């Protein structure tokens, strides 16, 4: 028993295609012993869905509790890097240089951060970035935590957490398409099926107890049917998106507990069927109050640029030389 | 630069830590040498007359190089370091000391030098480096140019050698003296009412230009004739009041892209006499986190003597539902 004993158990019987193990138990889900497992190479163990994992299921000794071999709950860092260097000090291209900083940003992660109950610090990685040339003068960054959400429709039973604290309104997802039942025409073309607009999930400033709503919109006046319950969110209090289509009526569908660090929603709370949504997986961005981001239970801060390039933009800036004369 | 600076840097290496020459495009004919005491900030007028009197040593009859103290750019740093409770042995008061040293060691080595530059990203890695227990830091900077005369910018202008943001330029506050009597038996029979005032900049125009406007007044004590009339824009930062004061006026102007700042209080009929200061400090947010020096400007951390330009917030961590 004991998660620690189990972590080993697997750092042996598998200690081949596995880099790390976190055996934690969830207080919401009794009798279930959860086993986080980093593939040591990629991201998901049997993304093929357990052709390998299921194998770990197939390891049994004692107890009335049952294993649930999962892939680690990944925290991502959407970094907007802005390194600046000296035109002259540089001998190879900006292209070769990028491939030089991300070689470092990786060295940091995989040595200090990509570990269980281990953490990430922006200041500490920007030291690694700075440390890629004779110049390279300095560097800026703007990060957000990312949680990848399977089934956009609704969060888990027990909500999703970051293992970190975010700021008011900080929480927002990427946009996805909502197929309004309605139909419209332009450019000599026809019905064009059903009108679609870009819609998304955002949080609101916390109330006097640490608790804002999780709202979704915009909409039409519209494509969502209003009840005694279902009513457009009452007031400004968050981040609205570009109505290049003019729209705006958002609806409440959950809440963030900022202090408790839990976020729940369920689109079924209004009456939209997942059919009315193109997507399956979405991204949930928030920006921390943390100058240090903590991983934790089954959570793991990882940097996989190749397979997750989207989570890193590098904007370089070249600089004129100074005094060359003496 | 070094052609004559170096020498000097030999006969005086025991004081001066930074020497460079330059001309002023404009003050044609004049060559100045900025020098920073290793021992602080401003060389003393005796230290300065000695050093000037080696100019005779090396024979030159023409008026020959003015020695002078460097044009300092200061970084008002608002630092935040979060550290691990377990791994920190001594006092918080100690830790600060330990890092406020690191900052200086970075400044002395990589920054306090002519045309070398300050990189917030670097000094933070110095901060990180100060203890084995300093998990991670963050930081917010401002630029401080310390103005010799508040009343009017130099003939030419004042510049940061760096890009600031909109409304960003703002001096501190200085007492303006209206001229009215207060009639208060508390302190006799007459105090001469004097309310604070500052000089801020407004938003870039179509074309890159802002207006350098000057803090709140009470209608009467500034005379307006058509031309010189209250500024109206709300495109700047107004200040905390307790008084009925909301009349700001326009002098000079900021050329944001060419960073030049000229103003002249005279543009409103207010003699120096009217203000009880002679020196001020101009702040402003950089655009970037890498800031630069140029002709005779020097960036410097002199913290036991400019302590007002650093503040440290620590955040002790354990494990852990919370660090703000």
UniProtKB/Swiss-Prot annotation, chain B:
Compartments reported by the entry: Virion
Which superkingdom heads the taxonomic lineage of this protein's source? Viruses
Q: What induces it?
A: Expressed in the late phase of the viral replicative cycle.
The family annotation for this protein states: Belongs to the T4likevirus baseplate wedge protein gp6 family.
Role: Baseplate protein that is located next to the tail tube (inner baseplate). Involved in the tail assembly. The gp25-(gp6)2-gp7 module is involved in sheath contraction.
Question: Which proteins does it associate with, and in what oligomeric form?
Answer: Homodimer; each gp6 molecule in the ring interacts with its two neighbors, forming an N-terminal dimer with one and a C-terminal dimer with the other. Heterotrimer with gp7; gp6 is part of a (gp6)2-gp7 heterotrimeric molecule. The (gp6)2-gp7 heterotrimeric molecule further interacts with gp25 and gp53; the gp25-(gp6)2-gp7 module is involved in sheath contraction.
Q: What is this protein called?
A: Baseplate wedge protein gp6
Naturally occurring in which organism (per UniProt)? Enterobacteria phage T4 (Bacteriophage T4)
Read off the lineage from the record: Viruses, Duplodnaviria, Heunggongvirae, Uroviricota, Caudoviricetes
Range covered out of full length: 342 to 660 of 660
């Amino acid at each position: 028993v004991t998660a620690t004993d189990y972590d080993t158990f697997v750092s042996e019987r598998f200690g081949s295609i596995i880099q790390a193990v976190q055996t934690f138990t969830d207080s919401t889900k009794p009798g279930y012993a959860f086993i986080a497992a980093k593939p040591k190479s990629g991201l998901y163990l049997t993304t093929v869905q357990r052709e390998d994992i299921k194998n770990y299921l197939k390891d049994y000794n004692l107890a009335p509790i049952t294993p649930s071999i999962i892939s680690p709950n990944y925290l991502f860092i959407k970094t907007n890097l802005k390194v600046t260097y000296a035109l002259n000090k540089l001998q190879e291209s900006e292209q070769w240089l990028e491939g030089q900083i991300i070689d470092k940003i990786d060295r940091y992660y995989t040595e200090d951060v990509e570990i269980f109950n281990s953490s990430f610090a922006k200041s500490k990685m920007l030291t690694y970035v700075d440390d890629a040339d004779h110049s390279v003068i300095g560097s800026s960054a703007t990060i957000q935590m990312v949680r990848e959400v399977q089934n956009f429709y609704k969060t888990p039973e027990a909500g999703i957490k970051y293992n970190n604290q975010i700021k008011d309104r900080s929480m927002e997802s990427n946009t996805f398409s909502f197929n309004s039942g309605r139909k419209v025409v332009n450019p000599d073309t026809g019905l064009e099926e059903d009108v679609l607009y870009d819609v998304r999930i955002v949080s609101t400033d916390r109330d006097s107890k640490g608790i804002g709503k999780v709202i979704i919109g915009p909409f039409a006046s519209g494509d969502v049917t209003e009840n005694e319950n279902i009513q457009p969110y009452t007031g400004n209090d968050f981040n609205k998106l570009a109505n290049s289509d003019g729209r705006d009526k958002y609806y409440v569908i959950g809440e963030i507990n900022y202090p408790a660090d839990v976020i729940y929603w369920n689109i079924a709370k209004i009456n939209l069927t997942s059919e009315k949504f193109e997507v399956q997986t979405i991204e949930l961005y928030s920006d921390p109050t943390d100058d240090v981001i903590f991983t934790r239970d089954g959570s793991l801060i990882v940097f996989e640029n190749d397979l997750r390039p989207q989570y890193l933009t590098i904007d370089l800036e070249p600089i004129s030389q100074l005094e060359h004369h003496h």
